[PDB]
Design an enzyme around this catalytic site. Structure first.
Site, short mmCIF file in Angstrom:
data_model
loop_
_atom_site.label_atom_id
_atom_site.label_comp_id
_atom_site.label_asym_id
_atom_site.label_seq_id
_atom_site.Cartn_x
_atom_site.Cartn_y
_atom_site.Cartn_z
N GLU A 155 -88.48 -10.26 -71.70
CA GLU A 155 -88.06 -9.32 -70.67
C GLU A 155 -87.56 -8.04 -71.33
OE1 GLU A 155 -86.85 -11.47 -66.58
OE2 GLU A 155 -85.18 -11.32 -68.03
N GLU A 237 -91.39 -17.39 -65.50
CA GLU A 237 -90.12 -18.00 -65.12
C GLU A 237 -90.03 -18.01 -63.59
OE1 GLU A 237 -86.86 -15.92 -67.01
OE2 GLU A 237 -87.64 -16.24 -69.05
#
Lengths: 592, 592
Positions: A155, A237
């Site tokens: 991320e 995720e």
């Protein structure tokens, strides 16, 4: 096995849908790896996914550990033998609601700008990868193993936009023999994807989200198409629960709605459940959130309201997802999940107790200095640090008591004069005036400072508050004092302590509960009646407790126990303790 | 002349009472030195006292300046010729309500713990003293000059208790040829005196206070006697007024009561008025106070409600003190004080105006960097720093405007996108969300950051906030941006600017007022109608202004003006300016 990325994932030449579940080997006792992995297979999933925590594998610079609960090779083996594929995410930064987002604390002592194209940073990763990647290389499908692909960073579009960094990190991974396909994961929207992805290098970008799968996949698809890529859509995720923090109520997500939201992902592509089985933040390895400049530590339990609870047992959410998957993909083979038992409730009397001040030299070799340093510069990367001085106390301008001030310390300080409690200050309150006893001459000042864990996400990853201990100094009246003894406490020495030494009330102390077990099983330590601290089971720190709540117990796996004489040692800092340690068959909660 | 310290000060073998007054040569135009010193002699005082500001004499490392307003030799000469003795206080730290307490900003870029026994710190002082002390050595009474004594450090008991530091500093002073008696000054109470004094080295300790002379001298005497010393009692700083800060009302001390409080000092010993004539904090050299972690900048005027006003003219307080001294010590010769005139009021029309963005390359050579540094690392030690980036703006998670956040910056930031104002954030507010225009692609982000001056006293002298500029970075959405041009603005280039270039509203700009004067006199610039910034008179920055108040004007000495064509340039940051610059014959004030 062959694996490549085209319109679909291609496994052995055939279109493949990845159904993955996150299990962090480092958050689960290795005795229970088979259990959790089996239950992942039983759900109908084909893949397991895990981070690799730099700050456990290289806790101290040059001291690598891949044994026991850190034996990733054995983890991947158990998965393979159960017929699961694997996704590994060996980023230096993993976030993961984990101490410092996985970064070793000793990085703070170096001249280094984290998550950027910094030569010293990249070099340290290179050296980390020299130790790690031999434990991964041969587990790749390209070498006959079960690992399908590996993530670059984590991320990064939620931290930076240094593309030279991403390219350099990918090159490092390849240099260490990673030849399986690579990927990034980010929030599925332009700002994060533009900053975080490696799409222009031909590397698959994936998305992280917990709902609105159509909205998010639409944006992810749009991003792919804008760069002329024809790729599978994967939620790397799928947040199927959430983490908890001290003083905030537990967050619970309805089982059936979760399944429904997950359905919409599976219809359109691949998925990885974050978390499938969350487990426990053993020791001091919990993470910390930040809102602006205010830190908010996360709890010991990483239950995460996941399909498997902290213990590893199946929840309504597990069954709802299992049912949903069999509706959408009926050919996938499923099974009944395994359930582990729990110890019958019991209470164990206090064996012995000893004050921290009495056993200081069994816990730490003191470092003498004119002025104090934070724990990282003392070679301590987690836990508690005691600073001791012998300040002269003398008359003040106004005749009133002399003011004590702690300047620039984190996260929580307890102040004592001649081993008597004066004050406790948390975060922002640190620096407020503490009135000293109206006395004369030199006196023993003790400051026990707790690292409650470094921020693991966002603007404050490199905040000056990431240094734990006393950074600037301590003032008496208007002057900074000189002359400290600095004790970097190693609580893993707790079983070696001489408990026949003296105990004092209203004082940090160790409390031993020695007790016999006929057969070891999973259990919960009841922390009600204790103030704040940690508990060690047969020499192993199973995590933090705090009366603040909402978690008021500590999970203890069977693997940490044995038949015969067991030992729990509580380190407790507030002066509140229980005459008997109670062990319960369920996790205890209170409203904060 | 001979000078030594016994029960009394001994001057030429005879008991002597020092009657001193603080005049900071660096805060008064050299044309008016004679004036101020004469008025000190006329009061009936025998001595003048001054600090030496390291951060002006060595503004940049290795670049020494002892010319013009920094010509301490000429200052001490004018004093001698008027028959005044002198006390010099050449500490690296002077406090003095002065930028960084006198420390050069480039010290922040070194590995160094200020005001402690740090070898790099002491070395830098050694090198400073190699340049300074030749301008002082021969002015000592021991070399036929008029300097009686010199201070070691300044109120060190109000910062530390490192005695090895004090001893080392004294040794440095002696090494550079200071053979006159040494002294320390501190708050007159045990805690400060114990920590701060050098009494065990046989060096005179003095006291700083503004009232309760008996109480304070009693404690000072008690301290002397406890160390078996028989010494004169001297108030090395008699605070006969006080300093002001932006947004706080002016503090005024009754003239007659001041005299009465001063009487009680003179009866029992020697005294130095702080301040006798305060003058002006020219440029950016104002100091800053701190309460806990909150900074409070001091104003440009150092009037200090002193016997002489900022201009140098005698106040009721002067006359009350003159009267009092003639009562207590009737043999001391006195005279009438000199009074300087003021320009008659006038208004000058705006000549020309130009925006900061149009003339950027005349003000600074930009330093390119991937990530930003504070101004000290750019070689800028005061003033304004502009950071420029070209961030990509793109869609957000929720579709709402992308958030801009400035991470870890001080003291005040103004944000612009495509040279249009977005937001202004002061101190603690810096880091709050700034909503970006809902636009697309790359855009010019400008952040003008103001150093409002480094804390000059107390716990925060080495606070992380002493670094001015952007320390960590700037975030768009969730990511830190990469790619800055960093402009260390030199406003002393303001007279060279091309004002025929464009001006824009709601924008930092320069405003020129060119005007003729028949004869130069002292004057006040009326700052009402301007928002915030600085004013330069014939190329010389005479200090800051702010509508906040309470000071709403800037003193300008005659020496900065000339017969013929003069020029005032206003740098103003808020976008509020006046069509005509008004010059008044008195200082203007408003209630904040």
């Amino acid at each position: 096995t062959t694996f490549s990325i085209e319109h679909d994932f291609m496994l052995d030449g055939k279109p493949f849908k990845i159904l993955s579940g996150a299990i962090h080997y480092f958050r689960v006792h290795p005795d229970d790896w088979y259990h959790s992995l089996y239950n992942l297979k039983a759900l109908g999933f084909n893949t397991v996914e895990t981070y690799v925590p730099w700050n456990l594998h290289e806790y101290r610079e040059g001291e690598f550990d891949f044994s026991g609960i850190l034996d990733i090779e054995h983890f991947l083996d158990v998965a393979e033998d159960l017929g699961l594929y694997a996704i590994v995410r060996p980023s230096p930064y993993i976030c993961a609601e984990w101490e410092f987002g996985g970064f070793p604390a000793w990085l703070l002592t170096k001249s280094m700008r984290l998550r950027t194209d910094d030569p010293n940073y990249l070099q340290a990763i290179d050296r980390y990868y020299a130790a790690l990647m031999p434990h991964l290389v041969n587990h790749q499908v390209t070498h006959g193993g079960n690992v399908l692909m590996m993530q670059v960073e984590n991320e990064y579009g939620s931290y930076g936009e240094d593309h030279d960094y991403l390219a350099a990190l990918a090159k490092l991974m390849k240099k260490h023999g990673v030849d399986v396909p690579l990927f990034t994961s980010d929030g599925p929207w332009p700002a994060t994807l533009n900053a975080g992805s490696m799409i222009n290098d031909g590397i698959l970008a994936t998305g992280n989200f917990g709902s609105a799968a159509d909205k998010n996949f639409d944006r992810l698809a749009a991003f792919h198409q804008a760069h002329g890529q024809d790729w599978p859509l994967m939620c790397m995720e799928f947040w199927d629960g959430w983490f908890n923090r001290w003083g905030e109520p537990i967050i619970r997500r309805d089982p059936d709605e979760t399944a429904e939201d997950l359905r919409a992902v599976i219809e359109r592509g691949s998925v990885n459940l974050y978390m499938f089985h969350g487990g426990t933040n053993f020791g001091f390895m919990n993470g910390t959130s930040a809102r602006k400049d205010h830190d908010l530590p996360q709890v010991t339990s990483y239950d995460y309201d996941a399909p498997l609870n902290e213990q590893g047992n199946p929840t309504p959410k597990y069954f709802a997802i299992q049912k949903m998957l069999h509706e959408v993909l009926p050919d996938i083979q499923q099974a009944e999940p395994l359930v582990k038992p729990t110890l019958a409730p019991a209470e164990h009397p206090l064996t012995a107790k000893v004050s921290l001040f009495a056993v200081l030299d069994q816990l730490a070799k003191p470092v003498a200095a004119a002025y104090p340093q934070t724990q990282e510069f003392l070679g301590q990367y987690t836990g508690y640090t005691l600073y001791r001085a012998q300040p002269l106390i003398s008359g003040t301008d106004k005749g009133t008591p002399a003011k004590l001030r702690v300047i620039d310390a984190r996260d929580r300080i307890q102040a004592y004069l001649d081993q008597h409690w004066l004050a406790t200050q948390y975060q922002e309150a640190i620096g407020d005036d503490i009135l000293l006893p109206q006395v004369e001459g030199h006196h023993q000042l003790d400051l026990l400072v707790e690292n409650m864990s470094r921020v693991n996400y966002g603007a404050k990853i490199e905040a000056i508050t990431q240094f734990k201990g006393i950074r600037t100094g301590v003032m008496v009246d208007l002057h900074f004092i000189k002359g400290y003894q600095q004790y970097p406490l190693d609580l893993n020495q707790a079983p070696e302590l001489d408990f026949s030494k003296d105990w004092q009330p209203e004082t940090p102390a160790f409390y031993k509960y020695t007790f016999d077990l006929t057969e070891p099983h999973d259990t919960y330590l009841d922390c009600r009646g204790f103030g704040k601290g940690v508990m060690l089971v047969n020499g192993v720190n199973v995590g933090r407790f705090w009366e603040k709540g909402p978690t008021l117990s500590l999970y203890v796996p069977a693997g940490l126990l044995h038949a015969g004489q067991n030992e729990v040692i509580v380190f407790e800092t507030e002066g509140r303790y229980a005459e008997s340690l109670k062990m319960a068959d369920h996790p205890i909660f209170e409203e904060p």
